[PDB]
Every structure is written in structure tokens, then in C-alpha cells.
Symmetry: C3
Subunit: 30 residues, 3 copies
């Protein structure tokens, strides 16, 4: 259970880093 | 405690997809 | 361990809410 949850958390941290970058790009352009 | 963490991770992941789509929709309007 | 996972989930929840705010704002500016 623990290793699967951690791999999911890592996946979340990645998706959120990338979303933050997209948003920061949008904020510059909008 | 453990159950609840796995459920929050599940609802987080089932939210990053909506946010991803919302951001992709915004990328087209700027 | 569960402690670290809870700490990361609280960080991910905060970033989620912040990105949701960022997206609401961007929607008003396009
Ligand atoms: Na991305
Ligand atoms: Na859910
Ligand atoms: Na995008
Ligand atoms: Na802002």
C-alpha cells in the first residue's frame, strides 16, 4: 500500500509542478 | 489513517485531470 | 511513512487550491 501511495504522490507532485508552469506562462501572456 | 490518505490521493488525482483540462482550455484563449 | 505522506498531501491540497484560484482569475481575464 505504502509504495503505491508514494508513487502516486510523486505523480501528483509532478503534475502540479507542470501545471504551475503552464499557469505562470498563461499569466505572462493573458 | 492509511485508508484516508489513499482516498485523498485518489481525489487529488481525480482533480488534476480537471485542472489540466481547464488549463488547456485557457491556453487557447491567450 | 504516513507522516511524510500527510505532509505532502497537505502541500498538494494547498497547491491545488492555489491553482484553482489562479484558473478562476485567468478565466475572468480572457
Ligand atoms: Na504540462
Ligand atoms: Na473522490
Ligand atoms: Na496546457
Ligand atoms: Na494572480
Amino acid at each position: 500500500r505504502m509504495k503505491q501511495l508514494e508513487d502516486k504522490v510523486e505523480e501528483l507532485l509532478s503534475k502540479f509542478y507542470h501545471l504551475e508552469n503552464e499557469v505562470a506562462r498563461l499569466k505572462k501572456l493573458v
